[PDB]
């Protein structure tokens, strides 16, 4: 009575039938439909609403059964057909302001996933990505994304990881028949690597196949790679990192200088081409990862280091930071005979920065600050960074970068002195201490009188000052009499009497403790 097209097209009776079939006691009503899957084939083709009605009823049946999956091959032969159909995509994308049948994609993807999770259909599982990251996304993302992220890398490839990867690689032929670019071919790299990493902590032929099948600029056609390149580079990085180690990598990577990964990454990141920062810096990271474990070539590590240092201009922060974290401990360990050489190259690239390129200098300062442990043996290079911090702290650092970077760079030399004494340029260290004294009582004014951040960093700078005097570097610290006078004498002018003077008072108390240790300062308290 409900399946009559005349009544099934009516919203009222269709909603009534849906509510009835959704009820708990609808077991016999669902059986008569499961016994006739061919009925939906006549509806899954102006009478286009029958498609949505059939997709809705199928979703209810699947949700209430959870086992009527292996008996619906002829159905999914049409259900997946409309899923991958360009007509469906266009019809549902072009006009979606107030169009009915809005939840069709969610239920369609849900039933497709329910079917594909019982039988491992590769083509269907990979075509499911049409709405996993790309396409149209209105509640359709998470239900499948969480599945592919947690359930898939749990029990999917427990027995046939290599065969599954080979199937996903052979997918290129059926994929190119309907999808030729990253929109699907790039997303397929995620479902595989979640497991490759979950079980990366077994498949030798796949490592040999991936390199030769995806030759540099696959198919000798670079024009088609826009985002697939970045994900292939990430694949190669995490591959040389965890799953295949030297044992499996060196077998085929012996031809690195040939079309293998080395040439797949080096020419693009070296030349000025590939203006897209993402792909360039991901190739840099791939080279860094390769160098970290193997491929001790003819000093190309220094070339990569230089290309990375000079290239991190505006927004390369994350990728270049990761590449340095992966490579910074690799170059010195594998350049024992060239420690002085690499340090002098660093000095050179530092002194060739006469333009001072503020953002480049900040990035380099942050780089050398992250790795405090790798420049204790180069105290000769502290003068440049100290002189740079001196000028950094003088600029109007309304922004967050300059003065915070300066104070943490001062903490860097504090820790350097700590590890040096308990295993230095005296005048520059005295100037550094005087700067920490000045900047500590200057940042207090950068922020408003009250009700705003900026005081916790001033307190941590005061703590840095307190701690820097415990080493034997305190005797030669200079009293900033004029700065203290000017800042605290502001109280004579009732304007701008903010708590900045209170931090100045705490610093005067710290220096009072110093003179308590060495009464010589009594003669310096005249101002």
């Amino acid at each position: 009575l409900f399946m009559m097209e005349a009544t099934l097209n009516d919203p009222q009776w269709s909603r009534m039938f849906m509510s009835f079939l959704k009820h708990k006691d609808a077991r016999p009503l669902r059986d008569v439909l499961a016994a006739n899957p061919n009925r939906f084939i006549t509806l899954l083709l102006m009478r286009l609403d029958l498609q949505f009605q059939a997709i809705k009823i199928i979703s209810i049946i699947v949700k209430n059964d959870d086992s009527w999956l292996a008996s619906q091959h002829s159905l999914v032969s049409q259900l997946r057909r409309v899923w991958v159909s360009e007509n469906f995509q266009e019809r549902h994308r072009k006009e979606n302001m107030a169009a009915t049948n809005w939840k069709e994609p969610k239920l369609l993807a849900y039933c497709l996933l329910n079917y594909c999770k019982r039988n491992y259909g590769d083509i269907e599982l990979l075509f499911q990505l049409l709405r996993a990251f790309t396409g149209r996304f209105l509640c359709n993302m998470t239900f499948l994304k969480e599945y592919m992220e947690e359930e898939i890398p749990k029990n999917y490839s427990i027995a046939q990881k290599r065969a599954l990867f080979f199937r996903f690689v052979d997918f290129n032929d059926p994929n190119f028949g309907d999808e030729l670019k990253a929109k699907v071919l790039q997303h397929i790299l995620n479902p595989a690597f979640l497991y490759s990493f979950e079980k990366g902590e077994d498949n030798p032929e796949s490592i040999t196949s991936v390199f030769i099948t995806k030759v540099l600029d696959p198919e000798k056609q670079a024009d088609m790679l826009d985002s697939l390149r970045i994900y292939l580079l990430q694949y190669a990085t995490l591959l040389v990192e965890h799953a295949p180690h030297h044992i499996h990598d060196n077998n085929k990577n012996r031809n690195s200088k040939l079309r293998r990964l080395m040439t797949f990454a080096w020419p693009c990141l070296l030349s000025k081409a590939c203006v897209d920062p993402a792909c360039k810096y991901s190739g840099h990271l791939l080279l860094a990862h390769i160098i970290a474990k193997f491929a001790i070539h003819k000093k190309i590590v220094l070339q990569v280091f230089h290309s990375l240092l000079k290239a991190h201009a505006m927004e390369a922060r994350a990728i270049v930071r990761q590449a340095m974290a992966i490579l910074t401990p690799a170059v010195p360990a594998r350049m024992e005979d060239g420690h002085q050489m690499l340090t002098h190259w660093t000095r050179k690239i530092i002194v060739e920065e006469g333009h001072t390129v503020p953002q480049l200098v900040h990035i380099l300062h942050l780089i050398v600050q992250h790795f405090k442990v790798y420049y204790p043996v180069r105290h000769h290079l502290v003068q440049h960074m100290v002189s740079a911090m001196q000028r950094l702290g003088f600029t109007p650092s309304v922004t967050i970068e300059q003065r915070r970077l300066a104070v943490d760079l001062s903490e860097v030399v504090i820790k350097w002195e700590l590890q040096r004494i308990k295993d230095i340029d005296k005048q520059h260290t005295d100037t550094v201490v005087n700067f920490l004294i000045r900047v500590a009582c200057q940042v207090n004014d950068n922020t408003n009188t009250a009700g705003s951040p900026g005081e916790v960093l001033s307190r941590r700078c005061v703590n840095l000052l307190k701690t820097a005097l415990r080493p034997d570097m305190w005797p030669k610290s200079e009293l900033k009499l004029q700065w203290f006078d000017k800042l605290l004498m502001t109280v004579e002018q009732p304007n701008q009497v903010n708590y900045g003077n209170i931090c100045t008072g705490l610093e005067v108390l710290s220096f009072l403790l110093t003179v308590l240790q060495s009464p010589a300062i009594l003669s310096s308290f005249k101002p």
């Binding site: 809005w102 996304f137 993302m141 203006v275």
Partner: protein, 581 residues
């Protein structure tokens, strides 16, 4: 020694290749080593004639001219003082004018760099030569059309440098009339369109030109050139997607232009405002990390100009925004801003429903749908994310705290938006006051309350004095810092305003889940208190609650928790009876 060492090395052409590089190394050492006052000015007075004689000769080249320009760039990097800056100004502005807008080397780039580093001293009497430079700027800007029109299908970095140099040189000095001439140049700006990389370089030249035209965000100027800015906006959509930094700077320059009232009113009538968050303001296929800035700019624009958009424009704007409201990759801040935009636009849609036969009910219901969907998604995932890291019986945690705060604000914004939307659909489409809702929106509201009674549970997490999150107790009878009280009060207000006999069905269906969540979250008890305090809705809710509790009475003897819950519910019922006897 530096003096007699650099002087004895004087060599013009006898050793062109490496002697100049050795002298460059020597002067770099000189610059890295401190110099005293007696060894400060004479060095520059000797360098200036040397720079002159070295630039006199040797005007894709890789000849000693390159190392000569490098020595010049180093002499520039010196920046010792200003007293000896006068003849260097003449030399720089003489070498600047020649061989520009051609396949020339970077000599002009460092030239503009030294020009920028030169005008910082505020030299009055050199305004004539920089005025000639501005005349050359007038020339090149008017020549740009012919340049792009002579190179067809059958370097390019000079214009951005010149533009930023003119910007920084017009910002510092006294305000003069020369900026009006630069404005007249903005009227003559180029708007038409490895060699393709050079054409993209020309596009970014135009982008830097526009970045200089940002002056539209300054003292008012006669703007009779809407066609030129429209062509430039078209070129922006024609700009490349691979360059992320330049696209970001372009979006910043655009949002800055849109930050004034006299420019917003001209945007909506341009191409029907169809060039919104469709893939024009962001990378086409390269990168979409700067998406937050573009979305914020578009939201501010549509908010300032919402009062002049027809049905189709607002409909497709909502269609484009609801797509990003659900994007999990975006920070929750953008989601809160989009919810604010939607709840502020709901009132405008309602007010405009009087025109064009309305058609607002459909869009308002369709966006209430996405609002309830966001409610459900956050109550399903955000609550789990926080509960999977709670420390019972008490850095990435610092950011997780900010995320928890963003979610706590998101739930409030969602409640407010849902209230404003409920006010909307019940006041448009003839219209009849307090029309009985249809079954569709009735079930939608049932699911809305069912899912929002869970989202409100985000207020049970607290921040400690050490940084670790803490889960609140089941019942403490406190004020909850007043943060959530108003939130659930507005949540109740959402339903207090709807039709009575629809409230009846909704709460007859959802009263068991209500008491269940109240037992699991005592903070929701005030929702029932607000329902019982509001007139025209207290009787129905009280009747439903008593009819539900009279059958669950024997359950009070099993455990003490639900017994106390039912006791408090009966106390509230008696209070309501006393208030609405």
């Amino acid at each position: 020694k530096k003096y007699l060492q650099f002087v004895a090395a004087l060599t013009d052409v006898n050793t062109p290749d490496e002697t100049k590089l050795k002298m460059m190394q020597e002067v770099s050492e000189n610059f890295e080593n401190v110099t005293s006052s007696p060894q400060y000015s004479t060095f520059l007075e000797h360098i200036i004639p040397r720079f002159l004689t070295f630039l006199q000769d040797g005007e894709l080249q890789e000849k000693p001219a390159q190392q000569l320009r490098k020595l010049v760039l180093e002499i520039i990097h010196r920046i010792p003082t200003n007293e000896h800056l006068r003849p260097h100004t003449k030399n720089v502005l003489s070498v600047m004018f020649r061989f520009l807008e051609t396949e020339n080397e970077e000599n002009v780039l460092i030239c503009l760099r030294i020009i920028i580093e030169l005008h910082k001293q505020f030299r009055p009497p050199i305004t004539q030569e920089i005025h000639h430079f501005l005349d050359f700027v007038k020339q090149i800007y008017k020549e740009l059309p012919k340049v792009v029109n002579r190179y067809f299908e059958n370097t390019h970095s000079i214009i951005p440098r010149g533009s930023l140099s003119l910007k920084v040189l017009a910002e510092l000095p006294i305000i003069v009339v020369l900026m009006y001439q630069l404005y007249k140049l903005n009227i003559h700006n180029v708007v038409a369109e490895e060699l393709y990389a050079d054409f993209i370089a020309a596009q970014i030249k135009t982008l830097s030109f526009l970045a200089y035209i940002i002056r539209i965000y300054q003292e008012l100027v006669t703007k009779y050139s809407q066609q030129m800015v429209k062509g430039m906006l078209q070129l922006l959509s024609n700009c490349p997607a691979e360059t992320a930094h330049l696209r970001k700077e372009l979006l910043i320059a655009a949002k800055h232009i849109l930050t004034t009232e006299l420019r917003n009113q001209f945007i909506p009538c341009m191409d029907k405002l169809f060039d919104e968050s469709i893939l024009i303001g962001s990378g086409y296929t390269a990168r979409e990390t700067l998406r937050p800035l573009a979305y914020s700019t578009l939201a501010d624009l549509v908010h300032h100009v919402r009062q002049h958009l027809p049905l189709s424009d607002l409909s497709l704007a909502v269609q484009l925004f609801a797509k990003n409201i659900d994007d999990e990759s975006l920070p929750s801040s953008i989601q809160t801003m989009s919810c604010k935009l939607l709840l502020n636009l709901v009132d405008c849609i309602r007010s405009k429903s009087e025109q064009e036969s309305g058609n607002g009910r459909d869009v308002l219901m369709r966006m209430l749908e996405v609002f309830v969907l966001k409610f459900h998604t956050i109550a399903r995932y955000q609550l789990s994310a926080i509960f999977k890291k709670c420390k019972p019986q008490s850095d990435k945690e610092d950011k997780q705290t900010f995320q928890v705060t963003d979610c706590r604000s998101l739930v409030k914004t969602l409640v407010c938006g849902v209230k404003t939307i409920t006010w909307g659909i019940t006041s448009c489409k003839q219209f009849i006051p307090n029309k009985q809702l249809q079954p569709k929106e009735t079930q939608i509201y049932i699911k809305l309350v069912k899912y929002a009674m869970q989202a409100l549970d985000i207020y049970q997490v607290q921040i400690a004095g050490n940084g670790q999150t803490y889960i609140r107790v089941a019942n403490c009878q406190t004020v909850r810092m007043k943060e959530e009280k108003e939130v659930l009060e507005h949540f109740a207000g959402v339903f207090t305003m709807m039709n009575p006999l629809t409230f009846k069905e909704i709460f007859q269906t959802t009263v068991p889940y209500m008491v269940e969540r109240i037992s699991k979250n005592y903070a929701l008890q005030i929702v029932a208190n607000s329902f019982l305090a509001n007139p025209t809705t207290s009787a129905l809710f009280a009747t439903i609650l008593v009819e539900y509790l009279l059958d669950r009475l024997p359950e009070m003897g099993s455990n003490v928790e639900l017994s106390n819950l039912y006791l408090k519910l009966f106390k509230l019922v008696f209070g309501s009876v006393s208030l609405f006897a």
